[PDB]
Amino acid sequence: MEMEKEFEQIDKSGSWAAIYQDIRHEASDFPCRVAKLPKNKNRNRYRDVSPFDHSRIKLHQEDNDYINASLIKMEEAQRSYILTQGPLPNTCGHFWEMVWEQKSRGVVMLNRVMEKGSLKCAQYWPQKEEKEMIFEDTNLKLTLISEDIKSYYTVRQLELENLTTQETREILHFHYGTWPDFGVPESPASFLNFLFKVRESGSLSPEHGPVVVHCSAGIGRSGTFCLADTCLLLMDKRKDPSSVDIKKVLLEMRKFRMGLIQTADQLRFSYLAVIEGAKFIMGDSSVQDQWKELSHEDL
């Protein structure tokens, strides 16, 4: 309601850039001293994207507990997310160690391994059933069990095994294939179709650890995904769309990780996705079938 009136106003006055820059100016600034230690330079994909000390995920290793990953703990919405960079060749074991220790059930990947001619993410999961991966540094084994390939995204079932204890867990991998770096999804429908696939899996349940969300830096596409989900959840808990202030929610999220949402068009898209998703939240169940058709997932 109030967010739709605000959307129309911003969009008629052509002021998304100024709205977005105001968010950047008001965003929190907290120290990232661990991320900037010399021994961690090769654990960071981007010099200017670091986790805050207060919200960084710590590995349960005695040597070096550092990974470029942040816990976004949304107190009012009662949902947590782990946002992280795309793993590097030397941090793939750390990534799966974090998944194990945090008891996550789902991993949401919003990028491709190669984008714009460069390698934006290591190949951190196995592409063939018969070629499992072993992470010797963290003593974990990862096997591809099956995969469901749709036209613009893929859902994989992985088996993660702690080789120390021989315990195994099913991890779901939700891989969005058509969301360009620094860009927006092709439509609200295709974004929402994917988001509700993650939701329906149970991966966002409070019974599990936080879902792990990443793109290449873990702030732009990842921030858009989490902002839309949190806004929809807030509206759902209250059953009241007009009670949600997207910009306040984004500023709250930015207390836990810098730079969430990287462009004014990604902010604008977040409004579009939440406004459209509100139709489902407020009881028009049939719109989910509409998104599935408009997303052309079965092509």
Numbering used by the authors: 1 to 299
Lines quoted from the article behind this entry:
Catalysis by protein tyrosine phosphatases (PTPs) relies on the motion of a flexible protein loop (the WPD-loop) that carries a residue acting as a general acid/base catalyst during the PTP-catalyzed reaction. All PTPs share the conserved signature motif HCX5R(S/T) forming the P-loop, which includes the nucleophilic cysteine and a conserved arginine, which, along with backbone amides, binds substrate and provides transition-state stabilization. Closure of the WPD-loop moves the conserved Asp residue about 9 Å into the position needed for catalysis.
Structures were obtained of the PTP1B T177G and YopH G352T ligand-free enzymes and in complex with vanadate. In both ligand-free structures, the WPD-loops are observed in the closed position. This is in contrast to the typical observation of this loop in the open, noncatalytic position in crystal structures of these and other PTPs lacking a bound oxyanion. In contrast, we do not observe any electron density for the open state in the crystal structure of PTP1B T177G. The T177G mutation in PTP1B raises the kinetic pKa1 by 0.36 units, whereas the orthogonal G352T mutation in YopH results in a full unit decrease.
